[PDB]
Amino acid sequence: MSHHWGYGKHNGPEHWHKDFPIAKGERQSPVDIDTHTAKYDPSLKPLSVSYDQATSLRILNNGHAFNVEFDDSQDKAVLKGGPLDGTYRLIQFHFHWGSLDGQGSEHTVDKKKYAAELHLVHWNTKYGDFGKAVQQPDGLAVLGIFLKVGSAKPGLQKVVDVLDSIKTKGKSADFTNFDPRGLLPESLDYWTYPGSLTTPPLLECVTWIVLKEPISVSSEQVLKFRKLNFNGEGEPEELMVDNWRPAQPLKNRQIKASFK
Numbered sequence: 001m002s003h004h005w006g007y008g009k010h011n012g013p014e015h016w017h018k019d020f021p022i023a024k025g026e027r028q029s030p031v032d033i034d035t036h037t038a039k040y041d042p043s044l045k046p047l048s049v050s051y052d053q054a055t056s057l058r059i060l061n062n063g064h065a066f067n068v069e070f071d072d073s074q075d076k077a078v079l080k081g082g083p084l085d086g087t088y089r090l091i092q093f094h095f096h097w098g099s100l101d102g103q104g105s106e107h108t109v110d111k112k113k114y115a116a117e118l119h120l121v122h123w124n125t126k127y128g129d130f131g132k133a134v135q136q137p138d139g140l141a142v143l144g145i146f147l148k149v150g151s152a153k154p155g156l157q158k159v160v161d162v163l164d165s166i167k168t169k170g171k172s173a174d175f176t177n178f179d180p181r182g183l184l185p186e187s188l189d190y191w192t193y194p195g196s197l198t199t200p201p202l203l204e205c206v207t208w209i210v211l212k213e214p215i216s217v218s219s220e221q222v223l224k225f226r227k228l229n230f231n232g233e234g235e236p237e238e239l240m241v242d243n244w245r246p247a248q249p250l251k252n253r254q255i256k257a258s259f260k
């Protein structure tokens with residue numbers, strides 16, 4: 001029980017396959033996005049991001065990241081279009097980030113690593129609930145957005161300022177009326193490919209949609225991410241940093257671009 005997966009030397013990504021053999025599967029994520037090789041697919045549609053009726057509820061430190069959770073019991077905040085067939089409901093978002101500004105993203109672009117990566121996780125409403133959706137090859141759609149360090153992202157600050165209250169694993173806080181539209185870049189140009197969850201159980205249920213344009217966050221904003229703890233309250237401090245899985249083999253997949 002006590003030797004659980006994580007991001008350390010003894011329980012990190014190179015160990016995950018022992019408990020989760022799908023870690024060596026045929027459609028694992030993340031991947032490197034080779035820009036010159038990705039092919040423009042003129043049949044891909046614009047993404048439809050409809051977040052105006054989003055109902056955020058709570059923010060949780062789960063010991064690996066923090067999740068901002070949404071009410072997904074109705075079609076409030078939904079992702080449609082692009083490569084997707086049907087309607088995908090937003091359930092949560094979270095980030096992956098580094099100990100230094102030169103690492104932290106899960107996807108890479110021509111081997112470049114960004115400081116962090118935002119994942120907005122959505123599930124296909126034809127499967128009725130999230131737990132059923134993760135058992136399907138087209139069950140989830142994760143919208144990935146890169147973060148670089150530069151100017152502050154004003155729409156991120158409300159997240160940053162609540163992190164002191166969920167420092168340690170298992171802590172949560174009310175987090176209502178947060179508008180995830182404030183985390184998007186200007187352009188919705190994207191790459192897409194079939195992949196997996198990037199944490200155990202690593203299920204091969206995700207249509208990945210990775211935006212081309214990064215958002216900028218300030219050094220102070222990402223420094224606050226790095227003050228979070230992997231540990232629970234009253235345990236030795238382990239800073240929550242480098243909670244990213246490295247790029248996995250592309251195998252028999254093609255990455256498609258929505259743009260020329």
Ligand SMILES: NC(N)=NC1=[SH]CC(CSCC/C(N)=N/S(N)(=O)=O)=N1
Pocket residue numbers: 119121130131132134142196197198199200201
């Ligand atoms: N609840 C339920 N029935 N199953 C599962 S499997 C993983 C999980 C937690 S959310 C799925 C993990 C995730 N979003 N990975 S990522 N980094 O976005 O690719 N719940």
Ligand SMILES: [Zn+2]
Pocket residue numbers: 094095096119198
């Ligand atoms: Zn993620």
